[PDB]
Structure 1
């Protein structure tokens, strides 16, 4: 059931937003503020920005046909972070910790 697997996707996103993961998930909660100092080049590098609130809205608006499409947006959000930032940036390590949560849940769904 595609409906049931999308309910699992909503459960994975709910955990990613949970207090347990907040110490490293918070940079991914909302769209990157491209007007902040140091982010003048974000829009030139990142063609398709993505964040957890936009994914939550896409789930609510039924913009994902299946778990594969939901997973693609979660992975786009982490890939944007890895592409934009230097490999030693604090946010890259936070993205890895959050991706560990996602990949384990997504694989076992």
Structure 2
């Protein structure tokens, strides 16, 4: 539907290109980053890559579904990371833009 298309073509597109998007565009690599607790704390990993793919394979049945995955991705980052780490700020920024654009979503 129109909403999933807006989330694809408008919202995801804007976040994807953002100067802070690079760490979010594929799943967290726990080994490559030296985060061996990661999968013990974050039991539902999400990333914009997985979300984009799902938006391409028509995985979602409603907008809120897709919205939830955005939220888990952010929530996850805020839960695992220290408050002082830049990655947290990076998510706050992206998260704010997601909300901004969701207000302008159709229906």
| Separation in structure 1 between the aligned mates of residue 33 and residue 63 of structure 2, nearest angstrom | 36
Q: TM-score normalised to the size of structure 1?
A: 0.91
The CA deviation at 1:34 is 1.1
- 1:10-49 to structure 2, matched below 5 A, reads 10-11=8-9, 12-18=11-17, 21=18, 23-49=19-45
- Counterpart of 1:65 in structure 2 is 61
Unpaired runs of 5+ in structure 1?
Answer: none
Once superposed, which parts of structure 1, at least 4 consecutive aligned residues long, lie more than 4 Å away?
none
Q: Which deviates the most, 73-82 or 9-18? A: 9-18
**Superposition RMSD in Å:** 1.0
Q: Which has the higher helix share?
A: 1
For structure 2, list consecutive stretches of 5 or more residues without a partner in the other structure.
none
Change (3 A) 1:37 1:8: closer
Helix, strand or coil at the partner of 1:31? coil
Q: 1:37 to 1:59 in 2, by over 3 A?
A: closer
Residues 31-56 of structure 1: CA distance to partner in whole angstroms, max 9, x if unpaired?
10111243100000000100011001
Secondary structure in 2 aligned to 1:100? helix
How many equivalent residue pairs? 104
What displacement does 1:58 show?
0.9
